[model samples]
Target: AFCNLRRCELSCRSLGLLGKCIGEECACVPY
Candidate 1:
C-alpha cells in the first residue's frame, strides 16, 4: 500500500508477467 510500484513492474518483468499498481496496491496480471 506504499509507493513502490516500480518494484512491482520490475518484478513482473523478471517474472514474465504484468505489473500494475491499483489504489496503492501492486497487482500482477497476465502479460
Candidate 2:
C-alpha cells in the first residue's frame, strides 16, 4: 500500500533520514 506522506516524512526524519514519497511507497533513506 502507499504510505501517508505526512506520517512518512516525520517518521523517517525523526531518525535523521529522508522520507520522500515516490510512486506508491515511501523511500526512507539517508540524507
Candidate 3:
C-alpha cells in the first residue's frame, strides 16, 4: 500500500523521504 505523499510529508519532515524514499510504494523504507 502507498501512503499519501502529502500526508507522509506532513507527518514526517526529514523522515518523509523515508516514506516514499523506496519507490512507488509510499509505505516502503530505504533501509
Candidate 4:
C-alpha cells in the first residue's frame, strides 16, 4: 500500500511541483 502523502505533499509543494515528487525520498509511495 502507499504510505502517507503528507511529507511528500509538503516536499513537492516546497520544491514547486505537482504529485511528481511524492515518493522521491520520503518513502511515501508503495512503488
lDDT (Cα atoms) of all candidates against the true structure: 0.82, 0.82, 0.55, 0.49
- 1-31, model 1: which lDDT tens digit per residue? 4858788889888878878888878888885
The backbone clash count of each candidate, in order, is 0, 0, 0, 0
Write model 2 residue lDDT over 1-31, tens digit each, in one string.
Answer: 7678788888987788888878878878876
Q: Where does model 4 exceed 4 Å of error?
A: 20-31
Candidate 3: regions farther than 4 A off: 14-18, 21-31
lDDT of 4 by residue, 1-31 (tens): 5644675666666556543334443432332
Query: How many Å off is the CA of 6 in candidate 2?
Result: 0.7
lDDT score at residue 11, model 4, on the 0-100 scale: 60
Question: 1-31, model 3: which lDDT tens digit per residue?
Answer: 7547776665555663445534654553544
Candidate 4 overall lDDT versus native: 0.49
Reference-based TM-score of each model: 0.51, 0.52, 0.33, 0.35
Q: Give me the overall lDDT of model 1.
A: 0.82
Task: Name the candidate, 1 or 4, with the larger lDDT value.
Answer: 1
lDDT of 3: 0.55
Residue pairs whose backbone atoms clash in candidate 1: none
